[PDB]
Amino acid sequence: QARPTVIRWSEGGKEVFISGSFNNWSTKIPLIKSHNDFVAILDLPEGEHQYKFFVDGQWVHDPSEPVVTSQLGTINNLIHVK
């Protein structure tokens, strides 16, 4: 069973999307604006996923969450889902 998981982006921007390894980087999922934040709920399998944000057309990671180096040599965020 995948776990509905809240993802929050607090760094601003006009439009915010997330992509990640949970679907082999195949889609850009919008986050919904809520006051100073943007928010999504993703259905994530147990385990770990790498992810990155696409904010006003630029790939960026969340500085408030853990990061890992991908084989692309870019910094992705990492989430562990129990």
UniProtKB/Swiss-Prot annotation:
Please tell me the species this chain comes from: Rattus norvegicus
Name the UniProt record assigns to this protein = 5'-AMP-activated protein kinase subunit beta-2
Assembly notes: AMPK is a heterotrimer of an alpha catalytic subunit (PRKAA1 or PRKAA2), a beta (PRKAB1 or PRKAB2) and a gamma non-catalytic subunits (PRKAG1, PRKAG2 or PRKAG3).
Described function: Non-catalytic subunit of AMP-activated protein kinase (AMPK), an energy sensor protein kinase that plays a key role in regulating cellular energy metabolism. In response to reduction of intracellular ATP levels, AMPK activates energy-producing pathways and inhibits energy-consuming processes: inhibits protein, carbohydrate and lipid biosynthesis, as well as cell growth and proliferation. AMPK acts via direct phosphorylation of metabolic enzymes, and by longer-term effects via phosphorylation of transcription regulators.
Task: Spell out the family assignment given in the record's similarity comment.
Answer: Belongs to the 5'-AMP-activated protein kinase beta subunit family.
* Regions annotated as coiled coil: none
Organism domain of life: Eukaryota
Q: What is the lineage of its organism?
A: Eukaryota, Metazoa, Chordata, Craniata, Vertebrata
Q: Which residues carry this modification: Phosphoserine?
A: S21, S34
Q: How is it modified after translation?
A: Phosphorylated when associated with the catalytic subunit (PRKAA1 or PRKAA2). Phosphorylated by ULK1 and ULK2; leading to negatively regulate AMPK activity and suggesting the existence of a regulatory feedback loop between ULK1, ULK2 and AMPK.
Write down which residues bear the modification named Phosphothreonine: T74
